[PDB]
Amino acid sequence: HIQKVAIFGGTHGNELTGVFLVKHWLENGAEIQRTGLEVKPFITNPRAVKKCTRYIDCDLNRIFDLENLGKKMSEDLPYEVRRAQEINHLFGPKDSEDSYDIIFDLHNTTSNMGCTLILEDSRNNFLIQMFHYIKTSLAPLPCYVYLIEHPSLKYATTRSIAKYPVGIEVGPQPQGVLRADILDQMRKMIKHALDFIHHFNEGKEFPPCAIEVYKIIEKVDCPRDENGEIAAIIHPNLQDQDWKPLHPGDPMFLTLDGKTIPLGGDCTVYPVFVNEAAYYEKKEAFAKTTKLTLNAKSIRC
């Protein structure tokens, strides 16, 4: 019932856990094969990987949409646009029924997020169930679900080609660096994800379940100069405390002088992607989330 599965690595070329795993699995997929399940590992941005850079012309993971995927194939096209098409053709088309069933996009963050799963749809019982299985399997190792469903802030990811897109994000890891513990953590996330798909194709019935997710609400920039240069930094107490609750009282930023700037607003939030290297460019110091619980109905077949 689920037949076509891919694992993407190297969507960003300087996030090496995915690149390294995939390169190995292309030479020996044993670890990712399951009986009755054919899984294809793939390097999405081979050129950014070669320059150990994040992208060449633009962020690949933001352009899998109509505006871009419908463009006439040319050679004056940004590399990543030319490439998003090549990928849509191989694992899609997006929104077609010939699309791959499931795509896992592998990712790293400099933030201290631990094992993270990214959910694009708050009503996909199938994914919710997958995520619950992985969570439960990993325990007591924590695992967190970032829900990026938003009327305007949902971006068009590489993995959104599939009917079931899955983001796998593990941190903290500096860009351009290959840590062993981070690699082990990612592997295990995948083992349990594939294990769940097998169990499902073997007709196992899953009761209802609830999981905690963190829902995007707003992205915060750091204080800036009169000239638009960085004017404070992530307060020591906020640094590395991804996922933990931050109340309106508490410290957010720190100047050199160094006055503390506190949260404000009227409600507790849960920060994610705190001090992510790649978001300095995007003017995002961190993202605010509300914690909530989602339910899945049972599923089978």
Ligand X SMILES: CP(=O)(O)N[C@@H](CC(=O)O)C(=O)O
Query: Which residue numbers are catalytic?
Result: 169
Q: Is 62 annotated as a binding residue?
A: yes
| Residue 254 beta carbon to a copy of itself: minimum distance, rounded to whole angstroms | 5
41 near ligand X, judged by CB under 6 A: no
201 makes contact, choosing from ligand X, a copy of itself, Zn ion, none, with CB < 5 to 8 Å by partner type, with none
Helix pair 180-201, 125-138: axis angle to 10 deg: 130
Q: Which residue has the tokens 């292309």?
A: 26
Tell whether residue 61 is among the known ligand binding residues.
yes
Mode of pairing for the β-strands spanning 286-296 and 209-220? antiparallel
Contact residue for Zn ion among 2, 5, 12, 45 (CB under 5 A): 12
Minimum CB–partner distance for residue 167 and ligand X (Å): 4
Q: Considering only CA atoms, which of 216, 116, 129, 214 is closest in space to residue 167?
A: 116
Among 16, 22, 254, 278, which residue sits at the site for ligand X (rule: CB under 6 A)? 278
Question: If 0-12 CB within 10 Å is exposed, 13-18 middle and 19+ buried, where does residue 37 land?
Answer: middle
Count CB atoms within 10 A of the CB of residue 157: 24
Residues 6+ apart with CB under 8 A from 55: 12, 13, 45, 48, 80
Number of CB atoms found within 10 A of residue 300's CB = 9
183 binds a copy of itself (CB under 8 A): yes
Residues 6+ apart with CB under 8 A from 257: none
Is 187 annotated as a binding-site member?
Answer: no
DSSP for 166-223, written as a single string: EEEEEE---TT---HHHHHHHHHHHHHHHHHHHHHHTT--B--EEEEEEEEEEEEPPP
Applying CB under 8 A, among 38, 46, 50, 52 the residue interacting with a copy of itself is 52
**Least separation, in Å, of the C-beta of 299 and a copy of itself?**
33
Cβ atoms of residues 246 and 165 within 8 Å: no
Least spacing, CB of residue 257 vs a copy of itself, in Å: 9
Near a copy of itself by CB under 8 A: residue from 40, 71, 82, 179 = 179
Q: Smallest distance from the beta carbon of 262 to ligand X, in angstroms?
A: 26
From the list 107-115, 131-139, 202-210, 244-252, the region that binds ligand X by CB under 6 A is 107-115
Q: How far apart are CA 270 and CA 287, in angstroms?
A: 8
Among Zn ion, a copy of itself, ligand X, none, what does residue 2 contact (CB within 5–8 Å per kind)?
A: none
What is the length of the chain?
Answer: 301
Asked if 174 is part of the footprint of a copy of itself (rule: CB under 8 A), the reply reads: yes
Interacting partner of 120 out of a copy of itself, Zn ion, ligand X, none (Cβ under 5 to 8 A depending on kind): none
Beta strands in 28-140 (DSSP E): 38-43, 102-108, 114-119
Asked if 80 is part of the footprint of ligand X (rule: CB under 6 A), the reply reads: no
Among residues 36 and 236, whose Cβ is nearest to a copy of itself? Answer: 236
Binding region for N-acetyl-L-aspartate: 54, 61-62, 155, 159, 279
Binding region for Zn(2+): 12, 15, 107
Kindly list the residues in this chain that would bind ligand X in the complex (CB under 6 A): 12, 15, 61, 105, 107-109, 118, 157, 167, 169, 276, 278
